[PDB]
């Protein structure tokens, strides 16, 4: 009958793809912290998801030609022998209205490609989207992880990256292979929300992340094989 | 150090208020299964939250004068000796545009009254909103539970209530006092998504969702008598 401890099947051959998408186009004056922080976040993510068995692939949206080339690949490639799919969307904080509006269209596109109708090979498999906001995607077995609720405070980028990706990567490296994934995201909620400014204008305010789950089972990333 | 198993402090004198809000006004014609189903949902919820230690209150929005009265009561009353706050928002499925638009403002108002700035006595304590949709609430230590995604299928009310409330109450009764609450909501996601239809709803399934800004594990262990 009903098993409260039922888990997603994570014994397939591969873990799956971990797509790290960098939103760059329509962003012009890029300071030194932003440029070195974005690279720190990507590299930190590439190490934590690779250690969990994912095949990391990193795109950006600067070259429209290469963008469609590599997007078509991940959308049409078969995931039948994969445990799950992960997609991380990275963006800069201080962006214009064109940059911010493009991100929303990109996020809708990405999430839409992996819904049950357009990707049979991921049906019944967790589809995890981690979005660094500058939303309303939904679907069975989706997990949406947001760095901040839209309209609320998020700390500026730093040479070492952003608060959300730093804390998410610390928990992933420390607890990724043991704890249930939503328990892990709850720890990121606490770690990030506890950080404080040393920007005297941002005194007293905090960054509150959020995650929205449509998963039906427990999700673990025990070491494979 | 950092405790990955840290949980909210739930040893206060009282558990807290469990507000059951019935959205009724502007519904143009109420069929028999809808009258009883809504009553079945309210009674089922009152039984389960009472057994978990909550002080249950049930309002509706038929009397405009009496509602602002009671909304003022639950908002301004002290929660300093309470573990948390729960609010269930019940509404009918087949509603007109006025009925649906009114629901959004009611939900936006209700959640707003319990923000940290508006309610000092619930700061750092979980605030749980369970919404039977016909959204964008946020805040630290908020837990939003939706019967359905924003614009997807939801099964219609019956004499015994709605699929979402029935399955929620079944899990609360069996596992409410033991399992972490988000783990319990995940079981609801599976139970509701597995139910099939016996007309024009072939191949459809209702996929619930919950959005967490909680920072700790949430349990409802039996209170100290």
Numbering used by the authors:
A (entry chain B): 30 to 163, 199 to 262, 266 to 292
B (entry chain A): 30 to 163, 199 to 262, 267 to 293
Quote the passages of the study that discuss this structure, keeping the authors' original sentences.
Following our previous work, which described rare natural Casp6-R65W and Casp6-G66R variants with significantly impaired activity, we examined four additional missense rare variants with single amino acid substitutions located remotely from Casp6 active site: Casp6-A34E, Casp6-E35K, Casp6-A109T, and Casp6-T182S. To assess the effect of mutations on Casp6 structure and function, we solved apo mature crystal structures of Casp6-E35K and Casp6-A109T but crystallisation attempts were not successful for the two other Casp6 variants. Casp6-A34E, Casp6-A109T, and Casp6-T182S did not show significant changes in kinetic parameters, KM, and kcat, for Ac-VEID-AFC hydrolysis compared with Casp6-WT, whereas Casp6-E35K displayed slightly reduced kcat and consequently showed ~2-fold reduced catalytic efficiency kcat/KM. These results suggest that E35K rare natural Casp6 substitution negatively affects Casp6 activity. In Casp6-WT the E35 from the large subunit of one protomer forms a weak salt bridge with R254 from the small subunit of the other protomer (and vice versa), stabilising the dimeric Casp6 structure. By contrast, in the Casp6-E35K, the two salt bridges are replaced by two repulsive K35-R254 pairs. In addition, E35K substitution disrupts a salt bridge between E35 from the large subunit and K284 from the small subunit of the same Casp6-WT protomer, possibly further destabilising a functional oligomeric state of Casp6. The crystal structure of apo Casp6-E35K did not reveal hints that could have elucidated a potential mechanism responsible for reduced Casp6 activity. Although E35K substitution may lead to the disruption of few intersubunit salt bridges within Casp6 dimer, we did not observe decreased in vitro stability of Casp6-E35K compared to Casp6-WT or dissociation of enzyme subunits during protein purification recently described for Caspase-9 mutant, which could provide an explanation for the enzyme inactivation. Located more than 30 Å away from either active site of the Casp6 dimer, the N-terminal loop E35 is found in the neighbourhood of K36, which together with E244 and H287 forms Zn2+-binding exosite next to the postulated allosteric pocket.
